[PDB]
């Protein structure tokens, strides 16, 4: 008895500029009729060195809809480069899309975002300081940490 079961996620923001917006073509199946708005949020771990930095790129609200399996296309402008530390910026990070209905999260696509330089030289030998402008977000679609939960979409 869930109202939305997100199934597929065709990430478009595969390794592209860090200043390119997170593009998630999610295909979810609205299993039931909805009452409130569906809150898909993209949470970019602001520091994989400190998780409490988790930033929020955007949150799309899909209102009450009478079920239906279909795809929508997420995009969200990049995080604050100042929020990310060295080891995270030129490193591995996660950007999770927690679908949050009624303030209750019922799924989490923890897409590992591997931030590695765009320019081959910089991949050859990563500059000691993180260049978010040279940074390319490789959204590891080979490693989607999908953690979904069951929530009360109702008031029971």
């Amino acid at each position: 008895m869930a109202k939305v079961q997100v199934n597929n996620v065709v990430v478009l923001d595969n390794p592209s500029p860090f200043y390119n917006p997170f593009q998630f073509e999610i295909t979810f199946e609205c299993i039931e009729d909805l009452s409130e708005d569906l809150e898909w949020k993209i949470i970019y771990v602001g520091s994989a060195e400190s998780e409490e930095y988790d930033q929020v790129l955007d949150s799309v609200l899909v209102g009450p809809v009478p079920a239906g399996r279909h795809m929508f296309v997420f995009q969200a402008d990049a995080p604050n480069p100042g929020l990310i530390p060295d080891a995270d910026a030129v490193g591995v990070t996660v950007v999770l899309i927690t679908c949050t209905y009624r303030g209750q999260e019922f799924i989490r696509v923890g897409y590992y975002v591997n931030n590695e330089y765009t320019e081959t030289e910089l991949r050859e030998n990563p500059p000691v300081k993180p260049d978010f402008s040279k940074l390319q977000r490789n959204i590891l679609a080979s490693n989607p940490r999908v953690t979904r939960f069951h929530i009360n979409w109702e008031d029971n």
């Binding site: 994989a48 080891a87 999770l96 949050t100 953690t147």
Partner: peptide, 18 residues
Amino acid sequence: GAMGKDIQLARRIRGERA
């Protein structure tokens, strides 16, 4: 320090965001 980036992220995904 936080060298284990993976596990940091694993935290947030497993149930740390919420």
